[PDB]
Structure 1
Amino acid sequence: SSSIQRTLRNLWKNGFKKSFKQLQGYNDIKSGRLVGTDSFGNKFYEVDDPVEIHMRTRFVEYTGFWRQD
């Protein structure tokens, strides 16, 4: 759930660009099925890994790079 096995799998699936965005605001390289975007532009993902903890099965990827609101 926190070991390098999960991080490396999520690193390879996402590619460098998306992961490096997660390495700039998220601080946790995660992957998941895209469930669509809103009007503003945020991309809403859901994780299908059997290793994520209870509350971390839905996350977002904001439009901005440096600042997230």
Structure 2
Amino acid sequence: SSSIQRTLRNLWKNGFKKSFKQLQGYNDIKSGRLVGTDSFGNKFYEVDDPVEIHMRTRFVEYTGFWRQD
């Protein structure tokens, strides 16, 4: 889950602009199947990667860029 291969595959799947945002707020480059979007606009993904650790199989993509609440 820390090897550069896991970051390479996620970098390629997302593309630049999606991954650049994760390189700005998330600090990690992840890719997952989209599950839904909520009333505020956040999008919630699920990670299918067999190497991802126990508590990191779901995450969010906040609407803003420089800030997250």
Give TM-score, length-normalised by structure 2: 0.99
* Structure 1: unaligned runs, 5 residues or longer: none
Give, in whole Å, the separation in 2 of the partners of 1:59 and 1:21.
Answer: 14
Partner deviation per Cα, 1:25-69 (whole Å, 9 max, x = no partner)? 000000000001000000000000000000000000000000000
* Structure 2: unaligned runs, 5 residues or longer: none
Give TM-score, length-normalised by structure 1: 0.99
1:18, CA displacement in angstroms? Answer: 0.4
